[PDB]
Amino acid sequence: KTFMRKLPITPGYCGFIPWLSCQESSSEDRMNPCVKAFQERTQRYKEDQQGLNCSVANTPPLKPICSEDTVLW
Amino acid sequence: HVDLDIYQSSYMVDYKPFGVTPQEQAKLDAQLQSKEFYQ
Amino acid sequence: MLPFVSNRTTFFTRYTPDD
Amino acid sequence: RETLEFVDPFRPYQSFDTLKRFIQYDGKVLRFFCLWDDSTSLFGDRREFVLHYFLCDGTVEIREVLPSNSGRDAMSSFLRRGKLPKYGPPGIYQPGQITDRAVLNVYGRADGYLLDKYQLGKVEQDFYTDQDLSIGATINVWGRK
Amino acid sequence: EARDLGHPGLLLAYGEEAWKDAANNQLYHCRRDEYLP
Amino acid sequence: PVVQECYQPFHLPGYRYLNAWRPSVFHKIA
Amino acid sequence: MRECISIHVGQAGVQIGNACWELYCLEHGIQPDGQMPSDKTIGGGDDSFNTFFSETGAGKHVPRAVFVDLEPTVVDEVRTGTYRQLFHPEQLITGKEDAANNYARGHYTIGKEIVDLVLDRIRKLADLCTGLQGFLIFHSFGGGTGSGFASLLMERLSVDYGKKSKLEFAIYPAPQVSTAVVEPYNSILTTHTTLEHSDCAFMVDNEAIYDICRRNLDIERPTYTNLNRLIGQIVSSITASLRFDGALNVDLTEFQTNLVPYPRIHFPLATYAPVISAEKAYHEQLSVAEITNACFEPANQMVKCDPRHGKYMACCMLYRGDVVPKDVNAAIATIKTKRTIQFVDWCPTGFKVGINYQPPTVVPGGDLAKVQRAVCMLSNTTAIAEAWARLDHKFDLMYAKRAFVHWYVGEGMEEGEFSEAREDLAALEKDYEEVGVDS
Amino acid sequence: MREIVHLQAGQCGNQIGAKFWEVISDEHGIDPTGTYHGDSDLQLERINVYYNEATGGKYVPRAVLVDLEPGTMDSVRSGPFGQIFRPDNFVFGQSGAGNNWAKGHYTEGAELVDSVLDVVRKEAESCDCLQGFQLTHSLGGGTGSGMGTLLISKIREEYPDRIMNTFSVVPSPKVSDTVVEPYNATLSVHQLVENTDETYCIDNEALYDICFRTLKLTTPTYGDLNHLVSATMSGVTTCLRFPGQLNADLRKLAVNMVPFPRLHFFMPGFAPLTSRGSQQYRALTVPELTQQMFDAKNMMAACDPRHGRYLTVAAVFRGRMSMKEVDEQMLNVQNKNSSYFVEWIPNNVKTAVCDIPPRGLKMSATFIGNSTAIQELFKRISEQFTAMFRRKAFLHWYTGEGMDEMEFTEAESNMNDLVSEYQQYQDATA
Amino acid sequence: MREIVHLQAGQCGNQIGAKFWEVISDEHGIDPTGTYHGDSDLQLERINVYYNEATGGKYVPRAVLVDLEPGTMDSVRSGPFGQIFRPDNFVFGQSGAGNNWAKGHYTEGAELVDSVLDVVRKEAESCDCLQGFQLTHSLGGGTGSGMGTLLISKIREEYPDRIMNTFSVVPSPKVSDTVVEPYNATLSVHQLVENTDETYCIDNEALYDICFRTLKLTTPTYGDLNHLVSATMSGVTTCLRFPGQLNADLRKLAVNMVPFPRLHFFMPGFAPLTSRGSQQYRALTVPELTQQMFDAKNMMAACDPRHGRYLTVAAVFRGRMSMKEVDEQMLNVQNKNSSYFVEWIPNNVKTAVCDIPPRGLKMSATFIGNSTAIQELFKRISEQFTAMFRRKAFLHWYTGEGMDEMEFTEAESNMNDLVSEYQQYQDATA
Ligand SMILES: Nc1nc2c(ncn2[C@@H]2O[C@H](COP(=O)(O)OP(=O)(O)OP(=O)(O)O)[C@@H](O)[C@H]2O)c(=O)[nH]1
Ligand SMILES: Nc1nc2c(ncn2[C@@H]2O[C@H](COP(=O)(O)OP(=O)(O)O)[C@@H](O)[C@H]2O)c(=O)[nH]1
Ligand SMILES: Nc1nc2c(ncn2[C@@H]2O[C@H](COP(=O)(O)OP(=O)(O)O)[C@@H](O)[C@H]2O)c(=O)[nH]1
Ligand SMILES: [Mg+2]
Structure with a gap:
């Protein structure tokens, strides 16, 4: 499917590692737990964004009841 | 609206971990038996 | 429409025998 | 009857206009008071926005109300006047993907274009309206609740 | 229920009069029945 | 679905006060 | 943020200011009392009303304008008008005696009594603003107050704010109809200051507007207020880019630079379109190509000259409303492919396009219809120089027999200044002829 | 590592760069809030090229916004992707230039260059290895044509080795919205030739020509014209941010595009441009991309290279395709149109491939060319x-x-x- | 491989070509969307002859529509199969010729032919090995009879070796709807004799006579006349698209049927024409077919073959039959009508057999002949x-x-x- 980083990436890595995100979240200053932390963090964010989106879809429309000419009047 | 195979790289579309008809392979297994155990 | 007052009918506008 | 000996005297022609809504509604603007919590996202706090729906065209503009000792830059407006998407942030469409008048081809001057009757590629778009927005509901303002 | 307005620009031209024109006496029996084919 | 209805202009014999002589309305209990 | 101050002078300035400030209060939605409507909330943007109004702590907006006149009656009606609580009592400045159609009276005898008054109240308004874009001045060359008391004012304004722009909207004497006879005497003497103490002029005569209103707007018995509403439309179209956003926001400095090639040539000609009544407006479709054509006929100029007799040299546009940029470009290409419209040899590209969003508002009880799109033109051309020649012809025939001079001499005018200004206007006329020559 | 400093001057630069940051935020899966909603890791592997990192998983653009008039900054900040920018990166003065090159270059430019230099120096030291600066502005304005050239002058003294690319807007004679336009342009192209590694000449009229005939847009605003520019800018660094079958970067083309230091004016092109009605009819294939590449219609400057000779040609392809179907067509287009290529340089064409196509599309290609027509x-x-x-x-x-x-x-x-x-x-x- | 491009000039050619593209699509099973909903494999094997591939499994016709008036294009687009056609192939002007051959060939056609030749060149280079082009027009129009000859006058020069076919409509003297009708025809037939490989003379009046008697329709609209024509193009290329026991194509018939290059006017014919009532009262066989086209009533031209000598005769068959039966019915008709056949050319008939019949019908045949009757x-x-x-x-x-x-x-x-x-x-x- 889409690219996921398999966990044991070698230490001599020249790539973006969310050091500040892992350090504010939990754990220690290592990329092997860091990248997993960022992964399920962004998965959780996608989850609640989808929840908000489906709630907005859930909200139903209402009846225009009356004519726009009378509304203008 | 958007695809996901847009996100494909040459490296891991080319190199992947490695993973004829059953009547034919069964026939060849019988052929192997009828020689290895043949007297 | 059904002229009879069946179970299909919902309103029923009539007088009381009192009236 | 349906194919060999069927006729059509008229040719279809769709037309748009906005001046009816413009000269009918014009200055009528619906105003609503908003709240977006940001306490979840680390250094975030409650913000008091103000929503404006323009009945003339259907666009939405959002202002903000700051406290007294607010450290913000005293911005004029959070969002400009535009049609707010309702399903979240839509992906960037291709250049020219969203059009108004579907056209067959150039009259091959400089003002010539033939509108094809069969609309073929339509980028369906959902936007908030006064119909959608009410009191008590929650609105996804470009990803914000 | 207001009357059918003309072209709204012409209504603005005409003014307030073309806005002004628009806006138990007898017993009756009634009914309604809502059915699904 | 589909709705249908009918009306009938009944007429009291004398010009009576047409505010106390109103036919009652019956609704379905369901 | 951009801010502008109005220094309307005299009866012509005050009457124009009543119509213009009525338009601004409707444009932003201001009540006559001053406060924003707590009930209705047309529009948005606190910065949108900051170019003209200055909101106070209580919430009321105070206009940035100075009403000055040497006769009290013209301002007293504003003091008892509908917008009395809107305008500042300090901002309204009156005088006991007027110049009585005398340039010398308002420049040396009656003006100097009151200069220290208006200068500081101007300074107070300038101290309220942070970044002042410039000054708009409205007056007339006929009356003494609008001419004499003006001419000293921006002379002192020039030495107080050297870099601040000073726009000039003024009433020229009409070629045929005149409301006074000593008017050319004030007209000739005032023309010096609009040369070395001005940045742009907005020359307009009352008769040319009279022709436009009777032909397009069907008003066969027009009044001064109908003239003042169109003038209000001109200035609002100029400052539309500052008030609201647009694709091509154009500041006053932007169009000053692309209108004035030489320091002595700062007299562009204005044009406004569409100017149509309500019944005709919806009957005729209006387009960007059509409204830009309406800017080009000689019959639609609010000056009495034929540009076909002259040469377009610097020409500025101000589109407004539901405008689309090709229709601007396709209109310009259509304009250029006309032998009837000619340009100078040294300006192959002389167009200044400005695009705004908000369509022009219509004041109720007015004459212009509600239109979706509009256009403003500021075409500087050399055909205006003929109008100065007619004034010189009228001045010369009067100057020869020494008529009315004892009024000016008795005020404290040296008679040689009358001759000196005449040579200045001769020199300015030749300067326009120099540009008309093609290499 | 390989970072880009995006400079942004003038009203034209501010609107174009705002459209640019919207485009690549979609490409990198960044919401207007500032978080990352992308699904694959390839969207976030080299986000440090354009985006600086902030706490709470927030990515801030590495751009500097400058304009002498504070009005345009309000319009940018109130954008859809308006709050993503940093207010300290907003640097603005109180008085405009009024389309005057001299005011923005000497008089009013001197008071704001210092604060601008402070921000760009801070943002330079924030990244650890900067490839170079990228500036978008207009040559007919007062700030971009003016102060923008001044900022070009000071930076080269400060950072000589770093590359700059400028996507400047060259004014057109046929349609012109400024009368002093010849003055500002002639006083800016002098600063360009002395201090510029590469220039991309963009003309508004050619964009209007494309929208009318190629894209069949009845009322496109400036955002659609800025959309074509933003797509072009993304198509240059697409090989840099993502892996590719044959990798390249800005310097790979810049070394290959400048035979002599005086010639650094390139005209860019974009391949997949068709009306929305005929998208189903068009077949996305390599031959049709190249035919849409080499026609005089598609190209977005105001010159016809049928009147000149193609000096050097660069073609960057987005997505996975065939290098054989690439290299053949560059060879066929070389052999057929022999008269339009110079003879003292065989193999005028440079090809680069990035395996990631742009969002919402399956193939795309960006053309950069130096020819005699400029x-x-x-x-x-x-x-x-x-x-x-x-x-x-x-x-x-x-x-x-x-x-x-x-x-x-x-x-x-x-x-x-x-x-x-x-x-x-x-x-x-x- | 073997591709045909369909040119479409004039109102007559536009309506006929629309039905032609209608008819061959159901044979190939293409829906009005443009997908392939057919069932059999050979139904989609040689679709590249007439159709071009598009993304998403979409097939588009290789047709170029040219008309001096835009009104007919609206109607053809409004046609049920108009969605299939590519939008850019619609090339059309503003003012028509008004049935003036003078205006179309010289005055207003010169402004359009350039826009035409770019498109047809694009279709020409789209395919690899083009067999030929195809044009349908009327000889009494202002566009088809006029600039239609202009196009084929050009298309000989750049593409000399390709086969040039036109299904021209010839005026009838008995029924005429134009007063300057011979003026257009006389100035047109000169253009055909110099530059055309083969011309099929179709008469509207002969179509009416077939509709009056053979199928006895009491209201034959123009659709039925076009459909009877629409069967004919399907009959001349059916051996090309589908395999047969004895294969043939356009070049195979053209070489054997033009004895001297100046004579290229031919009378076409179609075999299975019967009234709906008499479908029962029929015995579908090789001789029963053979009796039908050899009756001069079946011919859709306005000349009686019994008044001249048959120079060459070609009958291409559709369906599975016996070589012995078709060869013998060939032989008997040559022997019995000896006077109507020329003597210096022995074996005046050439036969072709395609195994695939039309869908829903067991047998079909198409007769094309060169006779002295023309x-x-x-x-x-x-x-x-x-x-x-x-x-x-x-x-x-x-x-x-x-x-x-x-x-x-x-x-x-x-x-x-x-x-x-x-x-x-x-x-x-x-
Ligand atoms: N267009 C227009 N012109 C006006 C208006 N009011 C006055 N004028 C012109 O002003 C000229 C006379 O000057 P006024 O404005 O009346 O008086 P003043 O400017 O105060 O100067 P003094 O008369 O000396 O006091 C007349 O010839 C008019 O043409 C106005 O409301 N609209
Ligand atoms: N293509 C394009 N050009 C623009 C846009 N905005 C402004 N321009 C151009 O910028 C020029 C004016 O620049 P200006 O605002 O004076 O630049 P500044 O003085 O540096 O702020 C005009 O000629 C426009 O063509 C845009 O969104 N797209
Ligand atoms: N058989 C047939 N003939 C047609 C059809 N439509 C038009 N025609 C003939 O075409 C002739 C008029 O052609 P015209 O419209 O002037 O051609 P143009 O000038 O090239 O567009 C008439 O004599 C008709 O008989 C059709 O659908 N079938
Ligand atoms: Mg007065």
Whole structure:
């Protein structure tokens, strides 16, 4: 499917590692737990964004009841 | 609206971990038996 | 429409025998 | 009857206009008071926005109300006047993907274009309206609740 | 229920009069029945 | 679905006060 | 943020200011009392009303304008008008005696009594603003107050704010109809200051507007207020880019630079379109190509000259409303492919396009219809120089027999200044002829 | 590592760069809030190229916004992707330039260059290894044509080795919205030739030409024109941010695109441009991409290279396709149109491939080319600069700033010297 | 491989071509969306002959529609199969010719032919090995009879070796809807004789006679006439698209059927034409087919073959039959009607068999023949053309477009030389 980083990436890595995100979240200053932390963090964010989106879809429309000419009047 | 195979790289579309008809392979297994155990 | 007052009918506008 | 000996005297022609809504509604603007919590996202706090729906065209503009000792830059407006998407942030469409008048081809001057009757590629778009927005509901303002 | 307005620009031209024109006496029996084919 | 209805202009014999002589309305209990 | 101050002078300035400030209060939605409507909330943007109004702590907006006149009656009606609580009592400045159609009276005898008054109240308004874009001045060359008391004012304004722009909207004497006879005497003497103490002029005569209103707007018995509403439309179209956003926001400095090639040539000609009544407006479709054509006929100029007799040299546009940029470009290409419209040899590209969003508002009880799109033109051309020649012809025939001079001499005018200004206007006329020559 | 400093000057630069940051935020899966909603890790592998990192998983753009007029900054901040930018990166003055090059370059530019230099120096040291700076502005304005050239001058002294690419907007004679436009352009192209590694000449009229006939848009606004520019800018660094079958970067083309340091003016192109009605009819294939590449219609500057000779050609392909179907067609287009290529350089074409196509599309390609036709653009400014300078018109605005007259003479002299040697390379025997 | 591009000029060609693209699509099972909803494999094997591939499994016709008026394009687009056609292939002007051959060929056609030749060149280079083009037009129109000859006059020069076919519609004297009808025809037939490989003369009046009697429709609209024509193009290329026991194509028939290059006018025919009532009262067999086309009532041209000699005869068959039966019915008809066949050419008939019949029908055949009867159709026009030209009537409309008078005389002279040589071949001794 889409690219996921398999966990044991070698230490001599020249790539973006969310050091500040892992350090504010939990754990220690290592990329092997860091990248997993960022992964399920962004998965959780996608989850609640989808929840908000489906709630907005859930909200139903209402009846225009009356004519726009009378509304203008 | 958007695809996901847009996100494909040459490296891991080319190199992947490695993973004829059953009547034919069964026939060849019988052929192997009828020689290895043949007297 | 059904002229009879069946179970299909919902309103029923009539007088009381009192009236 | 349906194919060999069927006729059509008229040719279809769709037309748009906005001046009816413009000269009918014009200055009528619906105003609503908003709240977006940001306490979840680390250094975030409650913000008091103000929503404006323009009945003339259907666009939405959002202002903000700051406290007294607010450290913000005293911005004029959070969002400009535009049609707010309702399903979240839509992906960037291709250049020219969203059009108004579907056209067959150039009259091959400089003002010539033939509108094809069969609309073929339509980028369906959902936007908030006064119909959608009410009191008590929650609105996804470009990803914000 | 207001009357059918003309072209709204012409209504603005005409003014307030073309806005002004628009806006138990007898017993009756009634009914309604809502059915699904 | 589909709705249908009918009306009938009944007429009291004398010009009576047409505010106390109103036919009652019956609704379905369901 | 951009801010502008109005220094309307005299009866012509005050009457124009009543119509213009009525338009601004409707444009932003201001009540006559001053406060924003707590009930209705047309529009948005606190910065949108900051170019003209200055909101106070209580919430009321105070206009940035100075009403000055040497006769009290013209301002007293504003003091008892509908917008009395809107305008500042300090901002309204009156005088006991007027110049009585005398340039010398308002420049040396009656003006100097009151200069220290208006200068500081101007300074107070300038101290309220942070970044002042410039000054708009409205007056007339006929009356003494609008001419004499003006001419000293921006002379002192020039030495107080050297870099601040000073726009000039003024009433020229009409070629045929005149409301006074000593008017050319004030007209000739005032023309010096609009040369070395001005940045742009907005020359307009009352008769040319009279022709436009009777032909397009069907008003066969027009009044001064109908003239003042169109003038209000001109200035609002100029400052539309500052008030609201647009694709091509154009500041006053932007169009000053692309209108004035030489320091002595700062007299562009204005044009406004569409100017149509309500019944005709919806009957005729209006387009960007059509409204830009309406800017080009000689019959639609609010000056009495034929540009076909002259040469377009610097020409500025101000589109407004539901405008689309090709229709601007396709209109310009259509304009250029006309032998009837000619340009100078040294300006192959002389167009200044400005695009705004908000369509022009219509004041109720007015004459212009509600239109979706509009256009403003500021075409500087050399055909205006003929109008100065007619004034010189009228001045010369009067100057020869020494008529009315004892009024000016008795005020404290040296008679040689009358001759000196005449040579200045001769020199300015030749300067326009120099540009008309093609290499 | 490989970071880009995005400079942004003038109203044209502010609107174009705002459209640019919207485009690549979609490409990198960044919401207007600032978080990352992308699904694959390839969207976030080299996000440090354009985005700086902030706490709470927030990515802030590495751009500096400058304009002498505070009005345009309000419009950018109130954008859809308006709050993503940093207010400290907003640097603005109180007085505009009024389309006057001299005011923005000397008088009013001096008060704001220091604060701008502070931000870009901070943002330079924030990244650890910067590839170079990227500036978008207009050559007919007062700030971008003015102060923008001044910022070009100061940075090269500070950082000589770093590359700059400029996607400047070159004014058109057929449609013009400024009368002093010849003055500002002629005083800016002098600063470009001295200090610029690569220029991309963008003309608004050619964009209007594309929208009317290629894309069939009845009422496209400036956002659609900025959309085509933003797509072009993303198509240059697409090989840099993502892995590719044959990798390249800005310097790979820049070394290969500059035979001589005076010639760094390139005209860009974008391949997949068709009306929304005929998208189903068009077959996305390599032959149709190349035919849409090499026609005089598709190209977004104001010159016809049928009148010139193609010096060097760069083609960057987005997505996975065939290099064979690539390299053949560059060979076929080389052999068929032999007269339009110079003879002293065989193999004028440079090809680069990035395996990731843009969002919402399956293939795309960006064309960058240096040809003799760009000299037609400069000489047509000489006809309008010299004719109006001959009468000394519109001079006191520039003279009132304190500048001399010899600057106009030397700017025309350098530009006339530029086109003459540019003409010389056209008539060159192999 | 073997591709055909369909040119579409004039209202008559537009309506006929729309039905032609309608008919061949159900044979290939293409829905009005443009997908393939057919069932059999050979139904989608050679679709590249007429169709071009598009993304998403979409097939588009290789058709170019040209008309001087945009009104007919709206109707053809409004046609049910108009969605299939590519939008950019619609090339059309603003003002028509008004049935003036003068205006279409010279005055207004010159402004359009450039836009035409770019598109057809694009179709030409889209395919690899083009067999030929296909044009449908009327000889009495203003666009088809006029600029239609202009296009084929051009298309010979750049593409000489390709096969040139046109399904022209020939005017009838008995039913005429145009007064300047022979004026257009005489100036057109000169263009066909110089530059055309084969011309099929279709008469509207002969279509009516077939509709009156053979199928006895009481309301034959133009759709039925076009459909009877629409069967014919399907019959001449059915051996090309589908395999047969004895294969053939356009070149195979053309070489065997043109004995001398000046004679390229042919009478087409279709076999299975019956009334709905008498479908029961029929015995579908090789001889029953063979009796049908050899009756002159079946011919859709306006000339009786019994008044001349059959030069060449070609019958292409559709369906599975016996070589013995078709060969023998070939042989008997040659023996019995000996006088109607020429003597210096033995074995005047050529036969082709395609195994695949039409869907829903068990058998079909198409007859195409060169006979001496066609020169009656030519001389009858000269009896008209001389009458108007003697009094110089209807001339200033042609003279007003800037041409001379001599082009009328040489066109008649070429027509005179054609029939005189044609008459000579009739009176030839073996
Ligand atoms: N267009 C227009 N012109 C006006 C208006 N009011 C006055 N004028 C012109 O002003 C000229 C006379 O000057 P006024 O404005 O009346 O008086 P003043 O400017 O105060 O100067 P003094 O008369 O000396 O006091 C007349 O010839 C008018 O043409 C106005 O409301 N609209
Ligand atoms: N293509 C394009 N050009 C623009 C846009 N916005 C402004 N421009 C151009 O910028 C020029 C004016 O620049 P200006 O605002 O004076 O630049 P500044 O003085 O540096 O702020 C005009 O000629 C426009 O063509 C845009 O969104 N797209
Ligand atoms: N058989 C047939 N003939 C047609 C059809 N439509 C038009 N025609 C003929 O075309 C002739 C008129 O052609 P015209 O419209 O002037 O052609 P144009 O000028 O090239 O567009 C008439 O004589 C008709 O008989 C059709 O659908 N079928
Ligand atoms: Mg007065």
